[PDB]
Amino acid sequence: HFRKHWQRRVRCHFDQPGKKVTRRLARRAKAAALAPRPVDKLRPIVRCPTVKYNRRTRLGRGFTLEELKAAGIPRLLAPTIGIAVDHRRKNLSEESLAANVQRLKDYKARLILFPRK
Amino acid sequence: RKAPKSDNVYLKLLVKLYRFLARRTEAPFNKVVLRRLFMSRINRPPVSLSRIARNLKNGNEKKTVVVVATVTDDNRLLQVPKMEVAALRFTAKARARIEAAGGRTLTLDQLALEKPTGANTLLLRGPKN
Amino acid sequence: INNKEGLLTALRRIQLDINPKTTPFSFHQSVVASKRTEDSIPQIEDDLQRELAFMNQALEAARLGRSLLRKEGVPFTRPTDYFAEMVRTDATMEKVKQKLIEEATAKKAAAEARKQ
RNA sequence: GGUUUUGCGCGAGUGUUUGGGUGUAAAACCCGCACGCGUAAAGGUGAGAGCUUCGGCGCAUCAUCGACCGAUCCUGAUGUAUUCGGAUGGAUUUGAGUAGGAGCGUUAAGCCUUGGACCCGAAAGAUGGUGAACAACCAUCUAGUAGCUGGUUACCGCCGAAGUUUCCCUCAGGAUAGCAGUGUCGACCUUCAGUUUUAUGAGGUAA
RNA sequence: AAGCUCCUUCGACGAGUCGAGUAGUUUGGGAAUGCUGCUCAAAAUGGGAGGUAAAUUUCUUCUAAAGCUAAAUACCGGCCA
């Protein structure tokens, strides 16, 4: 499979450790900007779509509005205190709702919220 | 032959030991062990615990199993009998399952000291291809 | 399910009269083979035996239809003076002549190369 | 990117290096979930290395008789929702099937395919420009490609050929076997032999 | 000025655009894979795309024809190291 001019389109990766250093320094810069805050936002537990991966779960995009309302977190405050919100996802069942609500109250139990001024 | 193809220095130590034995004793066992020590890895296929468990059946349960290869664990074998095996290498699960059953694990130099001529031994080869 | 009497009565609701004593052969133009076409084919997978069995059934049909049309007097033989349009365009028959002549010269070139 | 062999680690598993952590900072060290490949979803008899308490036990492998399965050929059970099912006895059955796993990763060497592809060597064709004055030149695609030449870099040692059988089809050719070599298995002067002898074949051919 | 709650009140969502026929071009891709040109030219419990032999198109999942937006990505050039 070398029918085309592959010489002009070879990508080497001699900058792999340098890019790893760059990524770690970017994370350090994020830490410097957000000093007591975590560098990541909280994300829900979701089930993998297909039948092949139905058994396992992973991290989602953001919490459903029903999950936030059931956990006692208002919708507008949630992105400002480190929680990700996804308006597209639906719960569709009482078992993902309970799991992500438990995740949200676990996050609330370990949060140090500071006053505005 | 004249030299083993292996670069393992302990393999060459075993080759020197069994050269001496084959020369200074009239035991065909030592000559066969030396010949198999000269042989390559593909010519020394792994012998599983189940194949030894089959061959340890009639009156050989009191004999010492000699394998010039690596004994591997077999998951198909549910119960491991008591066995005294002398081999080049043992995998971790195979050695653990042999010692957990009350059996024992040997190297070839301990065999050469305990059984210099191979009396009451059971020479076993792994399946070809 | 097989509600058989339902299929018979639905056929009766939609049957036309097919009786050789009442309607002529040209009306239906339908002939049914006597052989059931399951004994002539031992296994399904071989194409040659299945195709020759279908050939046998259609040849039986063609013979009996030709005999009945000869009894009827309805014209059967398409004559050479009758020119009509074709089922597929004459480009397609140019192509099929082209492959026949191509394999003909391929076979004769192989034979000539074996002679040479 | 395939394939054969030697070494090595682990082994029914194997592969840390996409990435994350860490660092004395392109090194070294560590690994959370995946993913790739592989594995999963014991019979008789006879030889046979080796062992033997001399009674025998018998590796790997081979031969032979058997066993089981995907599926195929009939016989067509209890049963069946009443139109579904296959129980028993039989087959010259197959398989890249089972019958106590061998693979994964890496290194070294050899071979094959594609990239400029061991080095140098057409006529061409295309794109975009420069000039004239009755197609030419320039740069690039382009290290274009086809055949066919020329050339292809120290020493010593050991082993060493063929220029043929058969098959198929392009003509512009490959495959198979042969000659040379390597590994494994089985015996081991048992056995083997471009040979004589004995019997034997076509020549009773000469005499 | 702002967020939330409640409800004997309301809730406007992009047209020579979808789509049909046809000619090119392109793609692994005739539900034309996408795009474009010509002719015709929509809807409102609507429209698009999928699932399904399962008894009829049951069900599922989104809203086109207006627009903005950092990061992870590329880099034979620029200022350097």
Side-chain angles (χ1 to χ4, degrees):
Chain A
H1 268 96
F2 284 146
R3 179 65 183 167
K4 312 183 209 188
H5 310 309
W6 60 286
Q7 256 62 52
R8 82 202 317 180
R9 276 172 265 102
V10 178
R11 174 106 74 231
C12 287
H13 294 94
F14 301 120
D15 74 300
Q16 181 180 16
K19 269 176 127 49
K20 180 184 192 186
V21 173
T22 307
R23 279 190 304 262
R24 288 184 45 94
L25 283 182
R27 278 177 225 111
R28 224 200 199 270
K30 280 198 63 123
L34 324 179
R37 305 174 193 68
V39 293
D40 199 27
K41 308 227 152 30
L42 190 81
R43 295 170 53 204
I45 324 159
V46 293
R47 190 150 303 270
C48 296
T50 54
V51 51
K52 179 195 192 171
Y53 300 113
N54 248 347
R55 311 279 180 90
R56 68 155 112 180
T57 52
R58 58 163 164 85
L59 278 190
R61 194 202 161 74
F63 288 87
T64 319
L65 307 179
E66 252 162 350
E67 292 170 326
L68 290 162
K69 184 51 168 246
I73 313 186
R75 179 201 209 300
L76 285 178
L77 191 65
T80 86
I81 58 175
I83 307 145
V85 187
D86 186 19
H87 76 265
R88 278 177 298 264
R89 203 173 55 100
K90 309 152 216 50
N91 280 136
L92 249 70
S93 89
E94 322 253 23
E95 283 104 334
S96 58
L97 181 78
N100 282 333
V101 153
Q102 180 63 63
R103 182 161 178 86
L104 277 177
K105 323 198 91 143
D106 281 339
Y107 180 78
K108 249 210 293 181
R110 304 205 315 173
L111 185 64
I112 312 174
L113 203 46
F114 301 85
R116 288 198 43 177
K117 64 192 164 299
Chain B
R1 316 164 202 168
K2 287 268 149 281
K5 289 185 261 44
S6 294
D7 225 26
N8 194 345
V9 282
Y10 302 98
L11 198 276
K12 316 182 172 253
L13 191 143
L14 288 172
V15 165
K16 301 223 279 204
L17 174 65
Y18 268 91
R19 269 194 215 269
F20 182 77
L21 282 176
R23 180 163 53 85
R24 298 280 315 259
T25 51
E26 316 138 350
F29 178 81
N30 297 328
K31 311 184 167 23
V32 168
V33 176
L34 178 64
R35 221 169 38 61
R36 293 189 192 178
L37 283 176
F38 283 140
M39 274 180 17
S40 72
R41 187 208 257 206
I42 190 49
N43 295 320
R44 286 173 332 209
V47 187
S48 202
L49 246 48
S50 71
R51 187 163 297 266
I52 311 178
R54 271 177 13 213
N55 284 298
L56 216 78
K57 77 308 208 183
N58 210 15
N60 303 356
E61 322 74 336
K62 291 317 172 33
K63 285 165 180 229
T64 301
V65 181
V66 178
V67 164
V68 198
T70 110
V71 347
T72 53
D73 180 36
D74 207 312
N75 296 351
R76 272 97 49 106
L77 186 68
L78 313 153
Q79 171 75 15
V80 178
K82 177 126 64 203
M83 41 190 330
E84 261 72 349
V85 186
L88 277 171
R89 214 170 56 81
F90 287 82
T91 76
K93 284 214 297 168
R95 154 151 25 212
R97 278 190 87 194
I98 286 181
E99 307 197 338
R104 211 162 47 107
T105 278
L106 249 56
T107 43
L108 291 188
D109 51 293
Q110 316 174 323
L111 169 84
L113 241 54
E114 157 104 358
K115 305 213 178 345
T117 55
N120 305 266
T121 36
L122 180 53
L123 244 182
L124 289 187
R125 248 189 302 193
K128 211 70 217 73
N129 289 338
Chain C
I1 81 178
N2 275 60
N3 193 12
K4 297 187 178 180
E5 58 62 28
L7 289 121
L8 295 174
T9 185
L11 184 66
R12 154 158 49 254
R13 292 128 63 111
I14 76 100
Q15 203 157 352
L16 76 185
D17 183 313
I18 306 297
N19 209 3
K21 64 83 145 203
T22 279
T23 165
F25 170 73
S26 298
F27 188 77
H28 38 85
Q29 211 145 324
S30 73
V31 56
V32 195
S34 36
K35 78 98 156 162
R36 230 177 167 274
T37 331
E38 96 311 328
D39 41 19
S40 205
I41 317 87
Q43 81 206 2
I44 303 328
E45 292 47 17
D46 45 354
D47 40 323
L48 295 174
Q49 184 53 49
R50 206 188 57 242
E51 281 334 289
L52 72 94
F54 298 161
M55 264 302 222
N56 169 318
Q57 189 206 274
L59 274 169
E60 228 183 298
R63 294 310 149 73
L64 208 173
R66 215 206 190 164
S67 100
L68 256 286
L69 282 205
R70 200 78 78 258
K71 169 302 299 183
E72 264 208 17
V74 152
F76 178 87
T77 45
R78 157 152 146 107
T80 59
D81 65 355
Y82 185 33
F83 304 86
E85 279 66 344
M86 294 300 293
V87 139
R88 18 168 157 186
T89 59
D90 272 11
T92 301
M93 311 301 219
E94 162 63 24
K95 287 223 218 333
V96 308
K97 300 325 83 163
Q98 193 288 343
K99 62 165 37 153
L100 297 153
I101 66 88
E102 263 299 327
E103 57 75 32
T105 87
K107 169 71 217 101
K108 80 83 208 163
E112 283 175 351
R114 297 301 72 79
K115 288 190 288 292
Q116 290 293 323

